[PDB]
Amino acid sequence: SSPGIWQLDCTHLEGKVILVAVHVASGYIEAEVIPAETGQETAYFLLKLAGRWPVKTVHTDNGSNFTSTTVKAACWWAGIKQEDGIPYNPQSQGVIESMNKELKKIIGQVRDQAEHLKTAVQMAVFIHNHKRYSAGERIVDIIATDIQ
Amino acid sequence: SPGIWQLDCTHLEGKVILVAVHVASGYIEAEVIPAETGQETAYFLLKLAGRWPVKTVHTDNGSNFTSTTVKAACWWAGIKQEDGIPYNPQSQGVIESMNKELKKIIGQVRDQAEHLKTAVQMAVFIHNHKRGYSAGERIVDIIATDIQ
Ligand SMILES: O=C1Nc2ccccc2/C1=C\c1ccc2c(c1C(=O)O)OCO2
Ligand SMILES: O=C1Nc2ccccc2/C1=C\c1ccc2c(c1C(=O)O)OCO2
Ligand SMILES: [Cl-]
């Protein structure tokens, strides 16, 4: 069911990890900076996400997070169906790749306006979600239509 | 209006829980911080505004209202910063009631997580999903209607 499908994505910058959740149908993103990708961090990030949007299905970003008992516990707790992120439609490798590139571009464009990477990442999330409908507008419409 | 949010700060286990309430829906976002600073408040508002169309924020106290860092974040994110003075006195009480409710939910989940921040996100989840529509459903409908 389209409105509740999200994809996890992990990318690297400045020796740190940027963990991303993409709402597949809209292109809307949430992101956080962490020292490294662990089951613990991934579990906590999904809990945050699911308290904020109606997350039904998550395509995990790799097999370690798919396997993680802590990630499984969070998915059970929050009512999320955990799936693999295997691009059976191969335009997912590329589409995610393109987003990471775009995200990194925006980060570079704002980088000097903040001391800490996490701040620049949130600025980039803001710009990405507001860019013109915007991704922010699309996700709200998709989910509102699903409630109605 | 669809873009009006209220900041709220409450205390638990020697820590601070920073809360943003979408006034029209009762939908909340929250984070745990060691103490309320302009810096933390600014970062929290940036995160919020990248995720929802935040037009106006009623700040929780005069220190955050005055903070140059909070003002910088509000300027950056296009947020009109206002005071949170309850000219309608059913705001003191309504916010107070939410903190009580939040703390109740936190206590109900507290033993399921080691760290307070996890329990707080569980409580956000439960609060936003509680049904008759949930706060999560209401915020999406309000904002979707505003776009259309
Ligand atoms: O046992 C649990 N069940 C869960 C269900 C949902 C989300 C986390 C958990 C968790 C534990 C948990 C997971 C990730 C964390 C974390 C904790 C914790 O014990 O505080 O602290 C920060 O990152
Ligand atoms: O100069 C700025 N302009 C802003 C506009 C929006 C949000 C933050 C800022 C900020 C600075 C800033 C504010 C709060 C932070 C923070 C930073 C930072 O320098 O990285 O790191 C964590 O918490
Ligand atoms: Cl929700």
Side-chain angles (χ1 to χ4, degrees), chain A residues 2-148, chain B:
Chain A
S2 175
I5 304 179
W6 293 73
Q7 170 79 244
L8 284 174
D9 161 50
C10 178
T11 189
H12 299 76
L13 203 65
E14 307 184 2
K16 284 176 176 75
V17 167
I18 301 173
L19 186 52
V20 181
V22 195
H23 183 257
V24 174
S26 64
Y28 171 95
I29 68 169
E30 303 244 349
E32 69 169 25
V33 171
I34 53 176
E37 194 175 40
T38 61
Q40 282 291 103
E41 296 285 3
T42 301
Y44 182 70
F45 178 74
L46 289 172
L47 175 61
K48 288 190 291 180
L49 184 68
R52 291 160 176 71
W53 295 102
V55 178
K56 183 195 168 195
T57 300
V58 167
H59 290 278
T60 55
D61 56 329
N62 61 53
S64 294
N65 275 335
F66 187 66
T67 302
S68 167
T69 54
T70 306
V71 170
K72 292 189 185 306
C75 287
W76 167 81
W77 199 95
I80 298 168
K81 298 195 207 174
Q82 196 197 27
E83 292 178 11
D84 64 75
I86 305 164
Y88 304 106
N89 172 47
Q91 272 158 130
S92 303
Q93 283 148 117
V95 167
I96 295 302
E97 180 194 52
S98 286
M99 185 192 74
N100 289 342
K101 202 184 141 158
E102 185 225 344
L103 250 179
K104 282 177 195 198
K105 187 172 179 211
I106 302 164
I107 291 166
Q109 288 175 357
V110 302
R111 191 60 188 92
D112 74 320
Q113 293 174 54
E115 176 176 10
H116 303 114
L117 182 60
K118 65 190 221 169
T119 306
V121 167
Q122 300 307 319
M123 287 173 168
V125 167
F126 182 107
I127 289 168
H128 173 95
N129 289 338
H130 286 263
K131 192 169 171 197
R132 279 152 188 313
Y133 298 95
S134 69
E137 288 167 339
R138 286 188 302 265
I139 185 167
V140 165
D141 183 52
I142 287 160
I143 292 158
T145 304
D146 192 53
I147 297 160
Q148 289 153 22
Chain B
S1 107
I4 310 289
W5 293 74
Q6 170 78 244
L7 284 174
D8 161 50
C9 178
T10 189
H11 299 75
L12 203 65
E13 307 184 2
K15 284 176 176 75
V16 167
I17 302 173
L18 186 52
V19 181
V21 194
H22 184 257
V23 174
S25 64
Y27 171 95
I28 68 169
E29 303 244 349
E31 69 169 25
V32 171
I33 53 176
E36 194 175 40
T37 61
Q39 195 85 347
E40 296 285 3
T41 301
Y43 182 69
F44 178 73
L45 289 171
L46 175 62
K47 288 190 291 180
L48 184 68
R51 291 159 176 71
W52 295 102
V54 178
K55 183 196 168 196
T56 301
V57 62
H58 290 278
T59 55
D60 56 329
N61 60 53
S63 294
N64 275 335
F65 187 65
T66 302
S67 168
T68 304
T69 305
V70 171
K71 291 189 186 306
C74 287
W75 167 81
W76 199 96
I79 298 168
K80 178 170 178 152
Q81 194 201 220
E82 292 178 11
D83 65 75
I85 305 164
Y87 304 107
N88 172 48
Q90 272 161 341
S91 303
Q92 283 148 117
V94 167
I95 295 302
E96 280 165 23
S97 286
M98 185 192 74
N99 290 341
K100 257 204 65 158
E101 185 225 344
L102 250 179
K103 282 177 195 198
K104 189 167 193 271
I105 302 164
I106 291 166
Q108 288 176 357
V109 302
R110 191 61 187 90
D111 74 320
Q112 293 174 54
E114 177 176 10
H115 303 114
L116 181 60
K117 65 190 221 170
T118 306
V120 167
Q121 300 308 318
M122 288 174 168
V124 167
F125 182 107
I126 289 168
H127 173 95
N128 290 338
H129 284 85
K130 192 168 171 254
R131 315 193 145 284
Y133 301 109
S134 69
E137 287 167 339
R138 286 188 301 265
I139 185 166
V140 165
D141 184 51
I142 287 160
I143 291 158
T145 304
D146 192 53
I147 297 160
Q148 289 153 22

